[PDB]
Scaffold this active site. Structure first.
Site: not given
Ligand SMILES: Nc1ncnc2c1ncn2[C@@H]1O[C@H](CSCC[C@H](N)C(=O)O)[C@@H](O)[C@H]1O
Length: 424
Positions: A225
């Protein structure tokens, strides 16, 4: 799997988006929803692509029914209103996309009052409180200036929850570097400390997302990110942080007070060198102090005795001098100011670093884990800073200040120049 997931997956095949040869399904992972390689993928392989027809940017709101009324609003305020509104219309292009979006994340903007007390004294709380309030005033202003005077376009009422829901979806999903774009398909990849490139961004319109790492079948496709965000930033922007202590930061805010008897001159010096009346300095763990912090600290603590350095005479070297050092009194003053600020700050937390570290040794819940991690880190930085200046207080006489630097080129032991004086 899950209903909504399919009602969204299909809607992507029925839009032409997800073809037959797109190695990447959408499954449930520890981090919610994610993209799992349907087969071995490799560095720089195109994972998926989406039509500009599907974005959700300032152009989409301008080219919509509410673009006229939002013609003046800032871009993020515009997008929120579009999102909130599109969400209400059960005939919106993204009816199924809205059916997949999480109602919440672990971003501090959703934390209850109890959860937030876990951040007592932290700079992240100050920052979250400050941001929450500001988005609120801005959204209550949007209500009376656009939402109410146009009940035709905005049928259903809009609550603070409605706004915050959107502000979040925008802050934790929109692709900046291309500046706010949404992409229902590629808007699924999660973050991984494993990725260290940050090249994924690409677009042929058509949004093209490519896998930065080689992923075997069954595994998850990830992306970085942001390599520069502090942990505090990751905590509020998305709902997560990293254990990497090099992500811990604490930002110091400096300013030339207007009650300073030399305000006008000082401000002229600062701006003349790239700094405003107010300046923010981000201090990361294990990093060297930011360039400009010490000189600006010295400018702030200037004082009558050394005020002579603000004359037109030095208006071309003053910053170099501030960079080297002014005087022991100036140096001693700023050191104490900083050290007191750290101690003052450190005392604002309700747990010790040891307590935080023991807590981490057990099983912590998402938000609690985020709070503990953040606060431990802030305390680490705070102490590092205080340590650095404690050392400076000891080495307070090793620095050669202005006056000394001045009398360095006296040339007392030159020649008996009086012998020549008599030869003319
Ligand atoms: N390494 C990580 N650890 C924990 N949460 C994560 C992550 N990478 C992404 N996310 C989660 O996913 C979001 C990005 S959008 C990605 C899709 C999300 N996993 C969903 O089910 O809708 C983040 O804001 C966070 O809440």
């Amino acid at each position: 799997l899950s209903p909504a997931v399919q009602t969204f997956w299909k809607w992507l095949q029925e839009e032409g988006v997800i073809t037959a040869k797109t190695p990447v399904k959408a499954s449930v992972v520890t981090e919610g929803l994610g993209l799992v390689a349907l087969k071995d993928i490799s560095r720089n392989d195109v994972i998926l692509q989406v039509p500009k027809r599907l974005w959700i940017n300032p152009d989409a709101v301008a080219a919509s029914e509410i673009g006229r009324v939002c013609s003046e609003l800032k871009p993020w305020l515009s997008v929120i209103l579009f999102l909130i509104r599109e969400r209400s219309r059960e005939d919106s292009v993204w009816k199924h996309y809205f059916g997949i979006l999480p109602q919440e994340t672990d971003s501090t903007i959703y934390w209850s009052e109890e959860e937030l007390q876990e951040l007592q004294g932290s700079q992240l709380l100050k920052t979250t409180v400050s941001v929450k309030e500001y988005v609120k005033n801005e959204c209550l202003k949007l209500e009376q200036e656009i939402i109410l005077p146009n009940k035709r376009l905005f049928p259903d009422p809009v609550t603070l929850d409605d706004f915050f829901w959107a502000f979040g979806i925008l802050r934790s999903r929109a692709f900046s570097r291309l500046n706010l774009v949404v992409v229902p398909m590629a808007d699924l990849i999660n973050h991984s400390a494993g990725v260290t490139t940050e090249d994924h961004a690409y677009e042929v319109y058509l949004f093209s997302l490519k896998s930065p790492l080689s992923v075997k079948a069954g595994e998850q496709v990830y992306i970085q990110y942001d390599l520069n965000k502090s942990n505090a930033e990751l905590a509020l922007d998305y709902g997560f942080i990293e254990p990497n202590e090099n992500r811990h930061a604490y930002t110091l805010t400096l300013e030339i007070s207007e009650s300073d008897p030399f305000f006008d001159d000082k401000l002229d010096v600062a701006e003349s060198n790239g700094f405003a009346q107010t300046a923010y300095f981000d201090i990361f763990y294990n990093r060297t102090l930011p360039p400009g912090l010490l000189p600006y600290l010295r400018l702030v603590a200037l004082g009558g005795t050394d005020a002579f350095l603000l004359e037109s005479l030095f208006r071309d070297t003053i910053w170099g001098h501030l960079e080297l050092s002014v005087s022991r009194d100036n140096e001693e003053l700023l050191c104490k100011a900083v050290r007191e600020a750290c101690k003052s700050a450190l005392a604002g937390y309700h747990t010790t670093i040891e307590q935080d570290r023991e807590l981490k040794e057990g099983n912590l819940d998402s938000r609690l884990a985020i709070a503990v991690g953040i606060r431990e880190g802030e305390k680490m930085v705070l102490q590092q800073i205080d340590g650095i200046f404690e050392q400076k207080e000891l080495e307070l006489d090793q620095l050669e200040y202005y006056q000394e630097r001045r009398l360095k080129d006296l040339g007392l032991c030159g020649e008996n120049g009086d012998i020549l004086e008599n030869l003319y």
